[PDB]
Amino acid sequence: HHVKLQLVAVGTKMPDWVQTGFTEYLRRFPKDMPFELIEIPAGKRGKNADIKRILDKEGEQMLAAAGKNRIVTLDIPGKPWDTPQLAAELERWKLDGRDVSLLIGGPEGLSPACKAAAEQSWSLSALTLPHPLVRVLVAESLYRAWSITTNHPYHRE
Amino acid sequence: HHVKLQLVAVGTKMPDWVQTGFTEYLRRFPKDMPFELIEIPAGKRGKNADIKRILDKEGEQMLAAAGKNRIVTLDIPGKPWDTPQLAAELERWKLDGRDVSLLIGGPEGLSPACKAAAEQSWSLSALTLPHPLVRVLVAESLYRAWSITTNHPYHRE
Ligand SMILES: C[S@@+](CC[C@H](N)C(=O)[O-])C[C@H]1O[C@@H](n2cnc3c(N)ncnc32)[C@H](O)[C@@H]1O
Ligand SMILES: C[S@@+](CC[C@H](N)C(=O)[O-])C[C@H]1O[C@@H](n2cnc3c(N)ncnc32)[C@H](O)[C@@H]1O
């Protein structure tokens, strides 16, 4: 009865250094808090493409991936959680008992349906961050939040 | 070479993926806005060490590297600039004409003198970020800010 953290993200080819950095954090998560990545393919964009519909198809794929999971969106206008707050949230998710889906939008951001479906929305920064860096920050900050919950040396070194 | 952006940062041994990611951004700044790294070595800490002094000695070195430059600290309680705001600031630094020293603290954070010396302070996140990731986020966000000022393709879509 341990909870799963699922990063649901649009885009499939992280630069090598980003994937290396992401894996170094992902792998340090304990067996009772598995951290896993689900990549959704980005819709093909063009001037002749209807951008709303491309975005909705992306969102539909994300929400389908989340299933019945608790839905948390990564979004610039979400809650600017500090590290103690994220640790408190991480603890709340565990009591809740449901797996958590963390949603990272593609180039055009999150679909309206995804923003609407969010039970919580989490802002990493007031800055517009590139999708690969969002992946790494989420992994690192959750790791730091987790290490606070178990008094692991990482959060205090 | 009108204004130079110099990152003054405590710590010397970045993980490889971090140096790769950091350089990837650094090498893309144009010759007329050079982005450079100055590393101050971290003081050797021990449970018998005077942290107050170690911190002062780090700051002393930082402030020496900055010289007469515009001094901007990276600090959690600084200004939570969004990306357009950072572009405007970058534009204001160019008008000022002074090179900009961007200060990143060591394991114990910035010295009292460095915080005192700051003309501006810049917050990347409400999160407690690890020193390597601060380096990468500063390089990318300034690169994105630069690309906005020059109507470069990086920041669009
Ligand atoms: C390049 S951004 C596109 C942002 C989009 N134009 C918007 O305003 O919603 C791609 C995705 O990364 C995530 N992201 C980028 N910056 C973020 C931030 N500062 N805080 C939280 N999530 C962020 C969001 O999930 C976003 O959908
Ligand atoms: C290990 S952190 C220390 C965290 C915290 N600022 C402190 O004083 O203990 C090292 C440095 O990274 C920078 N830093 C960490 N998180 C930051 C954030 N969210 N925004 C801007 N700078 C940050 C600060 O310059 C800090 O001195």
Numbering used by the authors:
A (entry chain C), B (entry chain D): -1 to 155
Reproduce text from the manuscript describing this model.
In bacteria, uridine 1915 of the 23S rRNA undergoes two steps of post-transcriptional modification—pseudouridylation, followed by N3-methylation—that convert it to 3-methylpseudouridine (m3Ψ). RlmH acts on the assembled 70S ribosome. RlmH consists of five parallel β-strands (β2-β1-β4-β3-β5) sandwiched between two layers of α-helices: α2 and α4 on the solvent side, and α1, α5 and α3 on the dimerization interface. Our data suggest that E. coli RlmH functions as a dimer, with the SAM binding pocket of one monomer and the C-terminal residues of its counterpart forming a composite active site.
The crystal structures of E. coli RlmH bound to the cofactor SAM or to the inhibitor sinefungin contain two dimers of RlmH in an asymmetric unit, with two cofactors bound to each RlmH dimer. Each of the two cofactors (SAM and sinefungin) binds to RlmH in a bent conformation in which the amino-acid moiety of the cofactor folds toward the adenine base. Three bights (U-shaped, curved sections) of the overhand knot define the SAM-binding pocket. Bight 1 (loop β3–α3) and bight 3 (loop β5–α5) shape the hydrophobic core, which hosts the adenine moiety of SAM. Interactions with residues L72, I74, L122, L127, V132 and the backbone carbonyls of L125 and S123 secure the adenine base. The ribose of SAM interacts mainly with bight 2 (β4–α4). The reactive methyl group in SAM is sandwiched between the backbone atoms of bights 2 and 3. The methyl group faces the C-terminus of the partner RlmH monomer, where the RNA substrate likely binds. Comparing the structure of SAM-bound and ligand-free enzyme shows that cofactor binding rearranges the C-terminal loop into a 310-helix in each subunit. Our SAM-bound structure reveals that SAM binding shifts the C-terminus of RlmH by as much as 14 Å, rearranging it into a 310 helix (close-up).
